[PDB]
Coordinates of C-alpha atoms and ligand atoms in Angstrom, one line a residue:
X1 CA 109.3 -124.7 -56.8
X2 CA 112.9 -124.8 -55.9
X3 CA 114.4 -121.1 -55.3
X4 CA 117.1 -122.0 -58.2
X5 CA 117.8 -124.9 -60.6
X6 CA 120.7 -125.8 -62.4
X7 CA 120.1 -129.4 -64.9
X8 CA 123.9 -129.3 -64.8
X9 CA 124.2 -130.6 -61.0
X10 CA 122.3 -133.1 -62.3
X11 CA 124.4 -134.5 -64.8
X12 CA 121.4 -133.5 -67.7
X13 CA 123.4 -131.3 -70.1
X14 CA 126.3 -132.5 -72.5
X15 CA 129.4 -130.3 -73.4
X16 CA 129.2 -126.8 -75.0
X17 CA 129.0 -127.4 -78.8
X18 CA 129.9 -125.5 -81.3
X19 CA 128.1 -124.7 -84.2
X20 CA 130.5 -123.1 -86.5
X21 CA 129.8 -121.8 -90.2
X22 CA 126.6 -123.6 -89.9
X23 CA 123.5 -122.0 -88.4
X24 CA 122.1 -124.7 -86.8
X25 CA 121.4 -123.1 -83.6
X26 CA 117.7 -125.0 -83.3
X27 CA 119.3 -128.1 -84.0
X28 CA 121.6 -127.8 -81.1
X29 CA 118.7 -126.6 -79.0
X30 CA 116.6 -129.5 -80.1
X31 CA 119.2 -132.3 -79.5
X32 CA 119.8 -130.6 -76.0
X33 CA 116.6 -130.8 -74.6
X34 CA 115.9 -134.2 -75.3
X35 CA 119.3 -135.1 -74.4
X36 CA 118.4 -134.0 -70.9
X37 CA 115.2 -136.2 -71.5
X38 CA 116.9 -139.5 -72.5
X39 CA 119.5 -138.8 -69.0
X40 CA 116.2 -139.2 -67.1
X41 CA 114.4 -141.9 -68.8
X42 CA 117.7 -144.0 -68.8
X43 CA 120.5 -142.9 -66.2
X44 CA 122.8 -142.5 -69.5
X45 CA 123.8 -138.9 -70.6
X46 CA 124.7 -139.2 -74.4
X47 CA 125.0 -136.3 -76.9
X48 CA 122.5 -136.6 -79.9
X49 CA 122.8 -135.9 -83.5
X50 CA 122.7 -132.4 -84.3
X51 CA 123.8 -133.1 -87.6
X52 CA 121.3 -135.7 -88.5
X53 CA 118.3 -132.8 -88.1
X54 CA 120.0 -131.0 -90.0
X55 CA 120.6 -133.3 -92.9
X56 CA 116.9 -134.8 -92.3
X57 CA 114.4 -132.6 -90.7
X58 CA 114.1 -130.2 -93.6
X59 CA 111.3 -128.7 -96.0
X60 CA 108.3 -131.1 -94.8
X61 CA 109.2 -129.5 -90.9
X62 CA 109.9 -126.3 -92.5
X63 CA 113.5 -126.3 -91.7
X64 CA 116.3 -125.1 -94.2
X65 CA 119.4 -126.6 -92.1
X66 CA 122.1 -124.5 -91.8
X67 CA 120.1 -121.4 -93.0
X68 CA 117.2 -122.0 -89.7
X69 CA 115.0 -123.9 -88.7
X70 CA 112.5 -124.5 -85.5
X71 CA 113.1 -126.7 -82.6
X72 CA 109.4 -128.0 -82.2
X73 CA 109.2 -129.4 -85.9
X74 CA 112.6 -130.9 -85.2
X75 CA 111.0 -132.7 -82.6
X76 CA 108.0 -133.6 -84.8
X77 CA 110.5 -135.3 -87.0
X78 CA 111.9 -137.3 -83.9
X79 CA 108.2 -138.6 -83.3
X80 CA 107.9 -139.7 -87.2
X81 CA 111.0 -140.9 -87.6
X82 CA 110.9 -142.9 -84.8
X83 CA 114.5 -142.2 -83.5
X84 CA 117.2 -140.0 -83.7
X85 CA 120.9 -141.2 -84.2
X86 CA 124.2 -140.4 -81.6
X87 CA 126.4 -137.8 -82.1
X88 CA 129.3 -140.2 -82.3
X89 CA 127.6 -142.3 -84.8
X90 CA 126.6 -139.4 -86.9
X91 CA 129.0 -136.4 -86.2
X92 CA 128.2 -132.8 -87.0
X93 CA 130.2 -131.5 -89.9
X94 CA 128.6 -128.2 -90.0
X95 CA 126.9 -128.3 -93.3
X96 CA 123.8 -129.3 -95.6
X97 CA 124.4 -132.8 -96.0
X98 CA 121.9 -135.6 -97.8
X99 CA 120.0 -137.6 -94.6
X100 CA 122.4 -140.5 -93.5
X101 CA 119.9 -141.4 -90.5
X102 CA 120.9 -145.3 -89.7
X103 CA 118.1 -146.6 -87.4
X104 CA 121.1 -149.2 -86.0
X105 CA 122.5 -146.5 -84.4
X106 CA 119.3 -144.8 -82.5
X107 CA 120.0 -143.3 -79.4
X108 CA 117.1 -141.8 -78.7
X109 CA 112.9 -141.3 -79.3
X110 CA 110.6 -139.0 -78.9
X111 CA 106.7 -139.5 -78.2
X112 CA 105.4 -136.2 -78.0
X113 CA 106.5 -132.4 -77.3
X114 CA 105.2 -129.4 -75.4
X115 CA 104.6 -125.5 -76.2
X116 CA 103.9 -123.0 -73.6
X117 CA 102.2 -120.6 -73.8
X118 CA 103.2 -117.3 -74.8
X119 CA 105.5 -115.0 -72.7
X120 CA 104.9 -116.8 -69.6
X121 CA 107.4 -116.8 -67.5
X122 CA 106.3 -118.3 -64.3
X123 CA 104.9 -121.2 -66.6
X124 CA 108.4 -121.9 -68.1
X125 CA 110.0 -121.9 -64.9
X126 CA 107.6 -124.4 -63.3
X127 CA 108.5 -126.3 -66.8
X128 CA 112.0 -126.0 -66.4
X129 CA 111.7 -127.3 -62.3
X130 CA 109.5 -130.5 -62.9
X131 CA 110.3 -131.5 -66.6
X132 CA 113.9 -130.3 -67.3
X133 CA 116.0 -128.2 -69.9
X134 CA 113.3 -126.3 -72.5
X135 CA 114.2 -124.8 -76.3
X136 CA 113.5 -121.4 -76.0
X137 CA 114.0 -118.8 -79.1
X138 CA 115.6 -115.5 -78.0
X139 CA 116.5 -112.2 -80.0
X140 CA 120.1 -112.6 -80.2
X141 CA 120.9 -109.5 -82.5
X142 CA 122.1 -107.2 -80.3
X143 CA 126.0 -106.6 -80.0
X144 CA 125.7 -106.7 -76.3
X145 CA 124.7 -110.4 -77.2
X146 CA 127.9 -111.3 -78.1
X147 CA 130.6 -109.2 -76.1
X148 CA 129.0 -110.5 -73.0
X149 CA 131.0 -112.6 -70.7
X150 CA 129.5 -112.5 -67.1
X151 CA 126.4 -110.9 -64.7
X152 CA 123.0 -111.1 -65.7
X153 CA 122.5 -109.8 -69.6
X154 CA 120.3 -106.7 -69.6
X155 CA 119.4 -105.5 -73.0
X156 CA 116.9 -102.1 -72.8
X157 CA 116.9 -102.5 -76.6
X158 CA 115.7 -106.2 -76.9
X159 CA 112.6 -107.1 -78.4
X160 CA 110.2 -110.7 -78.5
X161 CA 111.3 -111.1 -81.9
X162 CA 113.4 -113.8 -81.3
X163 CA 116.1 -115.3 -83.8
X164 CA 117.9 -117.9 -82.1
X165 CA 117.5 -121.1 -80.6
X166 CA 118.9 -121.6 -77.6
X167 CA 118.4 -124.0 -74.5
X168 CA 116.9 -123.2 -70.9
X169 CA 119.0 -125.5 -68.4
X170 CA 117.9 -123.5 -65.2
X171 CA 117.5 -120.5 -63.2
X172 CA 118.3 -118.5 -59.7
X173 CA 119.2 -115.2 -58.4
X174 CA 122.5 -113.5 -58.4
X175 CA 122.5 -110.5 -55.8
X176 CA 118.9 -109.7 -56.0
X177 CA 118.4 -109.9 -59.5
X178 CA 116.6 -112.6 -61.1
X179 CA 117.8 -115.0 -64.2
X180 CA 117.8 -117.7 -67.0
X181 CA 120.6 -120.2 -67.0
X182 CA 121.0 -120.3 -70.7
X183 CA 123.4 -122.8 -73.2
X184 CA 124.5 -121.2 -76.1
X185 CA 125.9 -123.6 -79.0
X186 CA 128.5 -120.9 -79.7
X187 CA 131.6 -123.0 -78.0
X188 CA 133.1 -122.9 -74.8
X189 CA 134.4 -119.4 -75.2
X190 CA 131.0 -117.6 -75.3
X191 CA 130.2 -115.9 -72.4
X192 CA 130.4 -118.0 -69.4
X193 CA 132.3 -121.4 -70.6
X194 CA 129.0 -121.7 -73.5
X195 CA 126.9 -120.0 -70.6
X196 CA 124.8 -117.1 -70.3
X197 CA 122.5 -115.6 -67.5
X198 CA 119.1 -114.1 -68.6
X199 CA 117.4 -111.4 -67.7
X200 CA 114.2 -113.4 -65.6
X201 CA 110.8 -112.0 -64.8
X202 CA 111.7 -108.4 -66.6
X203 CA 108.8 -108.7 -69.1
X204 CA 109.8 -111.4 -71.1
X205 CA 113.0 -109.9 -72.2
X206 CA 114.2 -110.6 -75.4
X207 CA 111.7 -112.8 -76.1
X208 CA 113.1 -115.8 -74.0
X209 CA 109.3 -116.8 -73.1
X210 CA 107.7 -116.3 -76.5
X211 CA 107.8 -119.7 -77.9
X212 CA 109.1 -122.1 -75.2
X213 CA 109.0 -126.4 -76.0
X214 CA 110.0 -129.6 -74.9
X215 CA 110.0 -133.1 -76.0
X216 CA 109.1 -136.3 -73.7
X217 CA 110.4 -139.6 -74.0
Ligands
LIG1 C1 120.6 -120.0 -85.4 C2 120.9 -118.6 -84.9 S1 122.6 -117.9 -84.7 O1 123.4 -118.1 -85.9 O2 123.1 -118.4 -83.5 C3 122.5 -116.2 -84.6 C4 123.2 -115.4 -83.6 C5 123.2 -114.0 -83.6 C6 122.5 -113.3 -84.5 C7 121.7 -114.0 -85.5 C8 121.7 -115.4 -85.5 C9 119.7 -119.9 -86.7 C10 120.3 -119.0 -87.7 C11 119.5 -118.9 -89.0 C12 120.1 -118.1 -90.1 C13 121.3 -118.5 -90.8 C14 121.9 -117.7 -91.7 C15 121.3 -116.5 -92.1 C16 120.2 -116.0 -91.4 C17 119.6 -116.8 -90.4 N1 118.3 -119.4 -86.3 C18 117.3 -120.2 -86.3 O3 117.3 -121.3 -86.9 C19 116.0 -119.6 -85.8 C20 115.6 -120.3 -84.5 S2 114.2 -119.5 -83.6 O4 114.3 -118.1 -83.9 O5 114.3 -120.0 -82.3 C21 112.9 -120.3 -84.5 C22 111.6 -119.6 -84.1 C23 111.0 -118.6 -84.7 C24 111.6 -118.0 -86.0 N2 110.1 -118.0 -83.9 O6 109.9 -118.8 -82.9 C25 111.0 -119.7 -82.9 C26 111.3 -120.7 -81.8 N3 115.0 -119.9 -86.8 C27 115.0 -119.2 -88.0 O7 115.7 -118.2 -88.1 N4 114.1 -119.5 -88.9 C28 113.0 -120.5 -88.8 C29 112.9 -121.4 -90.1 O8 112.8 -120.6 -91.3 C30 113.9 -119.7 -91.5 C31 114.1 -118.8 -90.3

């Protein structure tokens, strides 16, 4: 395993989105990883419809859109539906809408997905080296969350109860200590331009190992 990875370098991760009034957060996270997927299955980086989970990927998965939802049964939906539209084709408007999916406009599949297993770390890494970007669920509920902008994020008071959905798009080592290159679907003015750097191999922190999942094209 490489000493550090970044998905970016590799032209696997879209722009920073932004989720706005909605709380779509596994949507994003869900879209993103198999965005990363379809890049390396097809040389095309395209960004997938967030929006379209939302509006279709509901009770049956045991999503509630805007209000939650989890980024494994989103891609169990993928794998039923047997496609998942474009961004561009089906924007995200940030809201409960009725399911618009239009299979003429499928820019994607999925054939199966992935969990780890729980609170490994030196699993998800090894997953994040050889398959690519995973949908991690982190506890996000701490103020220090939000008011941070660079460094490695240390919270003493996390916990594994995680709360949002998030995206894992590589990791390294900045002066000695160890991290998580995380995406955040907060916009570009989160943290590091969308970015945040994780706490790595410090007990799970925050949860970032508990439920870890990727799809496969
Ligand atoms: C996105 C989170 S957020 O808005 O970015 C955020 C940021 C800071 C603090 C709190 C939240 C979703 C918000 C859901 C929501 C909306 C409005 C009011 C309350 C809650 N969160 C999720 O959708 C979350 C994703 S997860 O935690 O990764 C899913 C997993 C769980 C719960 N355990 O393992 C996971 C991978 N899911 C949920 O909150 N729910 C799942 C579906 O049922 C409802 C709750």
């Amino acid at each position: 395993l490489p000493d550090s990875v970044d998905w970016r370098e590799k032209g696997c991760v879209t722009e920073v989105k932004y989720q706005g009034s909605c709380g779509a957060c596994w949507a994003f996270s869900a879209v993103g990883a198999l965005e990363a997927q379809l890049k390396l299955k097809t040389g095309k980086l395209v960004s997938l419809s967030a929006q379209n989970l939302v509006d279709c990927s509901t009770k049956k998965y045991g999503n509630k859109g805007c209000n939650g939802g989890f980024m494994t049964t989103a891609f169990q939906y993928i794998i039923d539906n047997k496609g998942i539209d474009s961004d561009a084709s089906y924007p995200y408007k940030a809201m409960d809408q009725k399911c618009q999916y239009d299979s003429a406009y499928r820019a994607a599949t999925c054939r199966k997905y992935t969990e780890l297993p729980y609170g490994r770390e030196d699993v998800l890494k090894e997953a994040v080296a050889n398959k690519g970007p995973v949908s991690v669920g982190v506890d996000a509920r701490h103020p220090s969350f939000f008011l941070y902008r660079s460094g490695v994020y240390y919270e003493p008071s996390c916990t594994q109860n995680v709360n949002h959905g998030v995206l894992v798009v590589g990791y390294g080592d900045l002066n000695g200590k160890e991290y998580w290159l995380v995406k955040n679907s907060w916009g570009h003015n989160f943290g590091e331009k969308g970015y945040i750097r994780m706490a790595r191999n410090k007990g799970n922190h925050c949860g970032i190992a508990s439920f870890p999942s990727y799809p496969e094209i």
